[PDB]
Symmetry: D3
Subunit: 242 residues, 6 copies
């Protein structure tokens, strides 16, 4: 292995330069299955990697695990191996009334509620997605007729307090985040997820292209099939980025 | 006047919902001149407004003056008057070697080195441009064949220390900004300008669409010898691009 | 032109070392008119400059435009041309009950609600006015018998949310500034304006003397003539500073 | 499942109130194997859970995955299930010369270089370990004669820049973290790891007891030449120490 | 004098390496009196120093005065003189219902509501006590059967607003600290005092061992004898640390 | 006692509304001695209080001890007792070449390097002195012909690292303060002391008038060789100046 965590060698990628990075290890195979000659490369910790062909071009699929920390490791090590483009496919919770479960969301930029993005650029730097990847994702979504929403996403280091959930053990939310969801709502933020801030920031500040798309599995103001459409959309986007 | 600073009435706009907002008052007429039936509406402080027609649709052109403060006033008051889409056309200094004077830059999002954006959203919120406006700007730039670059822009509250210029009275830059340009360069930031952070943040957090395009009049990594001609010509292309973008946004 | 924005040459100032800097371009001529041999020097963007004589000494009057950004450019470029003393005359909104419209306010120091001051000194540095300029302004105000108030001023980068105005398009104020006016009131702050923080900080941290005086055109807790008195006061102060 | 991610039910724990939480899923079974009647309960995402008996008391072992985010989920959901005591056993990089690979480190408190801890308490709150858990860990380490060091640990959201590693794709470290390792060294910080800040803070601020122990697999001040054997042996001792500590905490 | 403030010479300490540092000058003699051959060494400003013997080992007792500023001076200068271990004995206000006046509190780490700790380490660094000193204090407390509580302490630069007291001249608390006590309570913080944050941080970040124990003289949610027990406990702890 | 720390009763002040507040308890009597009918009122912790008459008006003199924490207690409790005006007289270290030992410095505002001021107003609020008190101090200094300097002062919570002193036990200064003195120097800051930030902020934000004057006992830019005599003489003039200022403020 040429990297510390992924257990992958440069040759394993066979010249691949684009990677689809879902958060859940169990989704890696599903994504690879939509492409040609899918093969499992490695599985260590929360990092599962598969290789496949798209239009005769080798493509990588690697899980990041939940959170910016594990995400930064995967992205960094994949970059060390030649990957220059990253497309994240995730699951998300909508916080706007007009957005419905099943809808697909494309992130233009993210509210940085994480700590890892700060290890690449100060807070004033935008966690913005690459224009080409965003475009590809939008078109891909349109190509299959999925109800899509494009905009800002709140990327949190926590699933609970950071997303102002009170149905918890403590049933309490620290002051900084109390009343925070309502604030994001009034600002037009579409959803909550946990890896885009780190992904977009570290990529945008290091010459790497990144895109972000997620399927709505829940709406805070009010599933397997939704994941399916989002997966197709990201593979279709990758195709347009090759 | 229905607003405190612009000296404009709702009726003046004749139903206009899009405005092109240059920083310099003197550029307002130039921009309006590329459209039909251009008419001056008002002039107060650094706020000069003109109205014109584009494809049979009334369009506004209003100068913001330099900086997020004056920019936030103009945008806020124009919004009070019905404007929902804002396209900024400015001048900028490139900080990357591969970018040349005369090139056109489209901002996807901005590094917030201003104070006004913070009056609309905390620092963690991205100063991102509207996807539709950015797309229109990109296509418009392509439509006339201008050498274009798309990416991140550093928007500063100051022309000098914030952009780490030392050719100043004090010849000194406060610690926070010392060595800052090099940091931005390593991060891929394309340029320095002074209104996008405020514009994009206040719009993105209030349901308003905004786009940002600027012409390169200088490159910080490549010494000098400016050319009023070339410079005036660069402004020309950027103006044409923003008007073309507006057309696609109407 | 020896500077990038002002369109002025060192010789234009004829040895002037003090400048009165109003925010509104249209007020420049009014101020110059109270002095001798007033002459317009230039007009570019929001920067209008006039020269005049006061007690046989050349004095500059230059508009800064609204906000610290344009203010820092004007001050910096004027300094490059020899100006060492700056007196700002502005308009302001009082936030204390005992202060009335028409009253004149002299700022001793400012609450930094701007971004430009930070480009000269970290937030912990005080946006304090020069003792000599403050003194001159106080005496000048007294010399004409104007009802005067001396104290702290809140200098905001925005006219609306930063000054907690809700009569706006969004009718909303970001969390950081919600309930902020009341806080300033309890702290004795006298008013809101938009250039003193940047002016005083950049001057106080660069060996430049600065003073700040403004006329109250509105009281948040409850016009042409007020501007008139403030203008006289600043010209009278300049006279004592020459 | 009574929780959203762990896929566990209250009944699965059989009254367990203490959990050993390693970062790597693959270590869960190893830890459970040192106890009695070890049984796998679930495996979802980076969360692998096993149950076992220690002195006739049911004990849980659950992987957190790398980082405070996944750690906070696991801890929160385990707490929802009754766990009140958490003992983390990890791997770490030493940054002090006197500390050797193979040594065991017990964290009294951590430098918060993460983002998740901030979602439980402001930065001024200390990421301190529970006194009882720390004591148990210290005694346990002593009971087997392991070379131990007790002190402060720097817990980072990143493996690379946050730990000031330059052997990377960009080969660059953002300003805030440039020269940071040397600063931590001068302050006596013993090591770098990636979950203690979040673990200790969220537990210390919510009435939950937590302890932290890690085996040194590398020393940043002493070049390299890792040894899978030694490394695998270090993990072994750390595991034994944490299980022994749990025993004293039951 | 070999130091600027304490008025002490290296020889005065006769090889002492541990010091008990109370906040009140008047408590120095009381503490020294429990040991052998107590002798007053100096008295300057709020810094009173005494020397004594404990198990044949010279020990120092020096008052820090109230607050991190004076505390940092005393600790720094004592360190310059050879002291490597510091045990603070103070008075404190409990903020938890289950803690009673008279109880003894041992601080494991502190919430940094001070400014001095920041002059030694950034805010993210923990104001944690030395494990050995904490252990000694716990055992010492047990040795005399004192009702003890071990945990986190909020160390404030102010006695009033920082501890959210409203019975003041202004009867007002700045926004940052409004509702702060309740927050600390929900987080399990045991008490409020004014020197531990600075003490623990500066020591923990400079290779110096420090411990912190205080007697509860008041409970915010609901005296000479309490001080007595705390003094014994700290002397007993020092004995175990020699 | 009507207050928790000062051990003073409202009656003790006999209607006094102004207090001179030195940092050192030992200076309280010296200051009181220049006035009429000086009497010691109390002595507790670092708080020593004396009362005296100035032009037939009762005046208080109370030591604050070193630092904003003890300073805030004294000021708060004195205010509870009726004091509305505070004049601080201290000792200071100059950081500018043109300032000499023995010179007197009047602070117009302070750089807030303390923590206590933040307990009264956020960092953006200026630690500015009262205009009337500053004026009185300036005139008083002039009245005796002392070489005076008026300007900004850096008020630090620490005597050593915060004032970037390396002649210490650790011989190290935390990153935030490394190279800080030079920055303050370039900004024109005249000196370092340890109570003005807290004093001016808490007073300026609570309707209390405050002034600040200090005598230079050392200049950081000009090596050393202190003189107890000169030093004791500098304190003398500063004391005379503050008493004279109080007289003009009564
Ligand atoms: O409400 C949600 N919050 C959230 O963070 N997610 C995403 O799905 C995972 C949480 O289970 C995280 O990786 C995150 O990216 C989904 C959601 F539905
Ligand atoms: O180097 C530059 N920096 C800069 O900020 N600008 C832009 O032009 C104006 C300053 O001249 C500002 O409004 C800003 O948007 C142009 C430049 F060429
Ligand atoms: O309420 C007010 N707020 C305010 O900012 N001002 C000042 O006048 C201009 C706003 O029109 C700004 O330049 C500012 O300095 C006046 C006011 F009356
Ligand atoms: O140098 C190291 N840095 C580090 O963070 N670790 C730990 O091991 C994992 C990364 O490999 C993280 O969970 C972390 O806790 C180990 C190391 F050897
Ligand atoms: O409520 C309290 N708050 C407090 O800060 N203290 C402590 O006792 C002194 C206050 O009088 C300070 O030195 C501090 O350490 C005691 C208390 F009882
Ligand atoms: O260099 C100096 N630094 C300093 O802080 N002081 C002042 O004198 C005391 C420290 O000796 C503090 O109260 C402070 O106000 C004097 C000095 F000479
Ligand atoms: K993870
Ligand atoms: K302007
Ligand atoms: K003190």
């Amino acid at each position: 292995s040429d990297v510390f965590h992924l257990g992958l060698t440069k040759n394993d990628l066979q010249g691949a330069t684009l990677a689809i990075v879902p958060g859940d290890p169990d989704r890696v195979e599903k994504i690879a299955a939509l492409m040609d000659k899918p093969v499992k490369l490695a599985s260590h910790r929360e990092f599962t990697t598969w290789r496949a062909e798209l239009d005769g071009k080798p493509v990588i699929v690697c899980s990041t695990g939940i959170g910016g920390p594990s995400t930064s490791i995967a992205v960094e090590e994949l970059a060390q191996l030649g990957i220059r483009t990253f497309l994240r496919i995730g699951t998300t919770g909508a916080i706007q009334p007009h957005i419905n479960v099943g809808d697909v969301l494309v992130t233009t930029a993210s509210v940085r509620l994480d700590g890892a993005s700060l290890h690449f650029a100060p807070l004033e730097f935008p966690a913005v997605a690459d224009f080409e990847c965003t475009t590809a994702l939008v078109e891909a979504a349109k190509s299959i007729g999925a109800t899509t929403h494009v905009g800002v996403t709140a990327s949190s280091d926590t699933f609970y307090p950071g997303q102002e959930r009170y149905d918890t053990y403590s049933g309490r939310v620290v002051r900084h985040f109390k009343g925070s969801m309502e604030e994001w709502q009034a600002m037009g933020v579409m959803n909550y997820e946990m890896e885009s801030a780190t992904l977009l920031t570290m990529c945008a500040s290091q010459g790497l292209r990144a895109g972000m798309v997620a399927g709505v599995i829940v709406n805070r103001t009010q599933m397997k099939q939704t994941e399916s459409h989002a997966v197709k959309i990201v593979v279709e986007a990758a195709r347009r980025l090759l």
